[model samples]
Target: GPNICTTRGVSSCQQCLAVSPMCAWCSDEALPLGSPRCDLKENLLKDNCAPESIEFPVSEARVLEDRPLSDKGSGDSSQVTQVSPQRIALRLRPDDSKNFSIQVRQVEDYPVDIYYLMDLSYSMKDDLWSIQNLGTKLATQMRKLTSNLRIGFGAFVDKPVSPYMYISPPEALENPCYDMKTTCLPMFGYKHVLTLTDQVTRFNEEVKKQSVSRNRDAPEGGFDAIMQATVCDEKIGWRNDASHLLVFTTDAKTHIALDGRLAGIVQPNDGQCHVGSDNHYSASTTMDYPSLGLMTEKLSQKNINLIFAVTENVVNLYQNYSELIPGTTVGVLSMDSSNVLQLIVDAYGKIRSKVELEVRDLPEELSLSFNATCLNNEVIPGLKSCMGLKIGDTVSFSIEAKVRGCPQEKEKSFTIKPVGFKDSLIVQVTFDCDCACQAQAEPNSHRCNNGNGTFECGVCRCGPGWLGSQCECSEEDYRPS
Candidate 1:
C-alpha cells in the first residue's frame, strides 16, 4: 500500500525527495498507469527512482562551530596557526556520498592597525583638503568595528630628479607651483609623517600641516612609497597582532621598476627603509620604482592588506591589481576623496565576511558542489561562494561530492581553503567498489532457526500449515497426528 509522496500533498518535487529517505520521484512516463508508489523499494527500481539515479549526496550535512584557527579570546594579538572549526574532516566510501557544513562568525574583536599613505602631488590637492580632518572621523567610525584599533599616516610624491621633478631650473626647482600661487613643498620619494597613534588630534595635526608637492610627470612614485611602508614596520609602527590595513590614495597613474632609469638614476630599490633625518626619502634620486611583483611579495610577507583609493578613471587598473594581490581591493575615490572613509569601513566588513572555497586534488572521476546557508538562515542553495557577510554573522556550506564511476584509487584526499583566511578542510576517502559488506558481517542465528525455523542472513516466512521455517512439524501434526 505504499504511495507517492504527492499522495500526501507534498508541494514540490525537490522538497518531497529531500523530505525523507523513504521518498523519491517515480520517473516512468512509459507506464500506462502513472508511476506512483514512491514509498516502495521495488517500485523505485522499476520506475527509475532508484537511489543510483538521484544525483544528490546521501549523507546528511554536519556543522562544527566557533573553532577559529587563531587563538581566540587570549588577547595575545600575535599571529599563530591553529586548527579552525571550519576545518572539516570527512571520510567517504567510494560508492557512497556525503556532505558537511562550514560556518564563520565574529563573536569578538581583533586588534587592528590602519595606515593612510597618500600621494601629495599638486593634482591631489583637493583630496588633501577633503581628508584634512580625517583622523577624528576615521577613528570614531573604526571604533565601531574594533575598540583596540590604531591609525597611522604617510605620504609620497615623485622622486626629486630630472623628468620626475625639476632640479636644474633653480628658480623653478625651488617652488614648482609658485606660478600657480599655491605654496608648494619640495617633491620627495616618500615620507612617514606619523606612526600609529590612538590620539585622533595627533593624527589630524599631522595631516593639517601637509602641503602639496609638484612633480614633472603624470605618474607618481606610489609604488616606491608602498614598498617602503610595508617594509618599514618600525617606522610606521605596525603591530604584528593586529589586522593591518595600508590605504593608498592617489589621483594619477604610478611609476614602477624601470621608470627611474630615464632620470639617469639607475639603482634598483633595495627594499629597505630610507627615511632620512629631515623626514624625506633620501633615495629619491637613485632607486628605480619597485615592480608590481615585488610589491605583492612584500605585502604578503608583511601580512599587510592594501586598499587603492583612486579616481574612477583608473578603477579598472587597480581592480586588476587587486586580482593579482591577495587580500587587496580597489575602492573608487572621487577627485576630492569625499567617500574614502566610508569605502574603508565597507571594504573592511566585506573582506572579513566573504569566504571563498577552493577544492583541490579531487580524484578524476569525482566532482564537487556547494550550497551556502547565509545570514538569517537564508539559503543560497547550489552556490560555490559566500559573500555579503557581516560581523557576528553565521554562514553554512553544504559540500557534496559525487563519483562519476568507481574510484580507481583505494584512497584519496582533497584540500579546501577558505581563501584569504587561515582555515581549510581536508576530505579523506576510501573506496568500497567491491561486494564486501558481508566480508566481515556477523550473521545472526538468534531464535528464528529452531527445529521449526531455518536460518538466513535476512528473511522469514511460513509455509501453509506450517508456522516456522524448515516446516519442522506442521500445525496439522500438532492438532491431529
Candidate 2:
C-alpha cells in the first residue's frame, strides 16, 4: 500500500502535496467516500478522477535579473557584477527540492589596496629600513597581478603610558632609548604615515621619515593599531571596490584586550574610528586593546584580508591566531623583514586563488547543499569553494535547496555570496504549502449530518457533534444506542 505516491495521513490536498512531487489529489465529487483520493497522477486518471480534477503542483524557479558577469573591474564607473543571475524567485513545496546553477568568475584587473601596518619598536629599526626600500619594488612586482594598486603605511609601538613606557624621567618620556644613548622617537600607540596612493615614491618617502621607538614590555600594542586601521576607513583611504589587504609586520608578540589593566586603563576598546587630526590614534590610553572577537568582526565587516607577516619567532603564534579570523593568512619573515615583498605577493595569491561561498539569513526549515565544479571540470560534492583559481577563471556551483517543512512566513529571502567579494545572489523563496481546493470548500454543508461538518476535496471534515463516514451520524445518537 506504501509506494512513492502513497503515504500515511494524507487526507487532504495540502497533505497530499506535501507527500511527494509525484503525489496528486483527486477532487472528483463522484469518487467513493472511503477510497484513496491521494495517488499517482497516472493512477488517479486511470482509476479514480478525470485529468482536470487532479491537483499536482510542481516546484518552479525563475530568474528575475540575470546581468552578465563582469570581465574586469569597472574602476568605480559602475557596479561590478561577479555572480550571474543576481536575483532568483523560487516556488517550492515541502519534501521537494530544486536545483540551480550559479556561475562566478574572477574578475580581471581588480583594483588592489595594500596597507602596511608595521611595528616600529626599537628592535625593528633594521626592519624599517628594509620596508622603506620596498615601495617601488613591491609595486613593480604587484603590477603583474593588478594594474591598479595603491599602497599605504602605518606604524605602531606601544601605549605611551607608564608601565608600557617610561614616564617619570623627562628624558625617559622623550626617549625610551635614553639608556642606550640612541636618538629615537617617543613611544606611540599608532600613527598613520600615509593614505593610500599609487605614487610609489611617496610611499617610500613617508616610510623613510618614520623612526623607531622603544616600549617597556615585549608585547606591543599592535592590536590597538589594527583596530584603528580597520575602523578608520576614510582616514586610511579604503576603497569600496578594491581588494583590501592589511599586511601587519612585526617582530614581537601583541597585547590584546584586558592587557591594558596593567597600565590601569580599564575602558574596553570601542571598534570605531579614533584618528586624530595629526593622523595618530587619539584614544590609545583611554580605550583598551581590541579583543579577537572584535578584531575578527571588524575585519570581516570591512572586507579586509589580513596578512600577518611576523618573524620566525612568532609565526606559530600568529598562524594559530589567524585560524580564528576569517580572510587571514600568516607568513614567516626574516629578522629584518627583508623578504616582505615576496611574502605579500604569495599571501595575496593565496587569498585571491581561493573562493568561499556563504549563505546568510537562511530559515531553519530550509537547507542548501553545494557541488562545486572547479577548474578542469572536476566536480567536488558538498564543497562550497574552489581552490587555485586564476584570473578570469570561471567556477560553477550546483546548489540544491530543499524545504523539509513549511516556515512561519510564506515568503522568505536569503543571500549567497563569496567571503570577500561584494557581489551576491539574492534568493526569494515562496512556500506552496496551501491547497487550491481549499478555496472551493463548502462550510457546514448539508451532506455532513444536517450541516454539522464541512465538505472539501471529496471528503467530509467532521465538526462538533458529528461522526462516522460522510458525517452521517450524530455524537448523541451514536452513543451506545
Candidate 3:
C-alpha cells in the first residue's frame, strides 16, 4: 500500500509517474517503445524526459512552510541602514514534526562606536601619559577594521566620601590627593570627558588635562563609574545604529554594594543618571556602590558590550566577569598601557568572529534539534548555534521541532537569532493531527470475487457469508482453498 515504485511493477511511464515525488520516467523515443525506465531527476532529464512534458504532479514531502525573515537588500550595507524583518515565521502540522533551515551572513565593516571609560585612580597615574598620546594612533588602528568608527572618552576615580577619599580638612575637600608624594587632583565620582567624535585633538585635550586621584582603599569605585556611563546615554552620546564598546581601564580591584556603609552611605544605587552642575556625580557621596546585578541589567538593556582593560594581576577577575555579561570582553593592560591598542584590536576580532544562536519560548511538550554547517563547510551536529564564525562566512542550520504531547493551539511561534546581533527570526508552527483523505472514494464497485463484496475507499464491504478485501475467504472458514 506504499507508492507504486516502492510497491513493485514500476515498469511503465505512468507507473513511474505514480512511483514517488523523486521518481520520473525516461521515455526517449530512441529507446525501445515498450520498455520505460524509472530513475531520479538527473537521469530522467539526461535521458530526454524534458521536465516541461512531465504531467503527473510530484508529491512534495517538504510539507513544512518556511517564511524567511530576510529579503534582498536586507543585508546590503551600502543600501540598507538598519537590521530588517524583526521576526520570521513558519507553518507546520500538529502531529507531524517538520524541518527548516536558516542562514546567517555578516555585513562587512558595519558601523562601530567605542567609548573609553578609563580609571583615573592614583595607581594609574604613570600609565596616563602612555594613553595621553593614544588618540590619533587609536583611530588609525581602529579604522583598519571599519571606516565609520567614532570614539568617546570618560573617566572615573572613586566615590568622594570620608572612607573612599580623605575628607578631614575642609581645604582637603578641594584636593584629596594633595598630601600624596605624587602631584594629584581632587577626588571625584566620575566625569563625562567627551562625547563620540572623529577628531583626535579634542580627545587628546581631554585626556591630558585629567590628573590622578587617590583613594583610601585598594579597591576603586569602578562599578559606580561604569553604571553612570551605561545609564547616562544622553551625556555619553551613544549611537543607535553602531556597535557599542565600553572600554574600562584600571589597575586595581573594584568595591561594590554595601562597601560604602563604612562611610555612612547606606542608600542603594538608583542606576539612573545623576550628573551635576560641575559635571560630576551629584550623589557620589550619598549612594552605595552599584551591585553587579544592577550593572548587568543596565548594560544588557543598553546593548553596550564592555572591554575590561586592566593589569594582568586582576585579569582573571574580569575574565570571570565576562562570562556573566553576554557580549562583554576582557583584555590585560600593561603597567604603562603600552598594549592597549593591540589588546583592543585582538578583542574586537574575537567578538566579531563568533556567532551565538538562541531559541526561546518553546512549548513544554515540544523540543527542537539542529545540525549546523559553519563557514569552513564542516557539518556539526548539535543544538548549539554558538561558534567562532568568521566574517563573510555563511552559517547554515537545519532545525527540527517535534511535538510529544497534544497541542492546545492551531499554531505556535518561536524566535531564532545570533546573540548580540541586531537581526532576529520568528518561526510560526502548525501541526498535523488528522487523517489525510480526499473525496475520491470508490462507488458501486462489486467486481471483488463473485460479487460477494462491495468496494469503497480502497476497502471491501464484504457480504454476510464472505470476508476480506476481495471476498476470497468465508467468515466461518479458518482456511479457504
Best by TM-score: 2
Q: What is the lDDT of residue 253 in candidate 3?
A: 85
> lDDT tens digits, residues 341-434, model 2?
9999999988988888888899888899999999977899999989988778888999999997887699889999887877889999999877
lDDT digits (tens) for residues 15-117 of candidate 1: 3444454454442233224554234455656654435433222333333343554434235543333324544444343334666655544434666789999
lDDT of 3 by residue, 226-299 (tens): 89888988888887656778889998888879998988989999998998656688899888999888898787
CA lDDT scores, all candidates in order: 0.68, 0.87, 0.69
Sliding window of 10 residues with minimal summed lDDT for model 1: 454-463
Root-mean-square deviation of candidate 1: 13.6
**Model 3: lowest-lDDT 10 consecutive positions:** 432-441
TM-scores of the candidates are: 0.59, 0.89, 0.68
Stretches of candidate 3 off by over 4 Å are: 1-86, 92-97, 181-183, 265-270, 276-279, 359-370, 401-414, 428-481
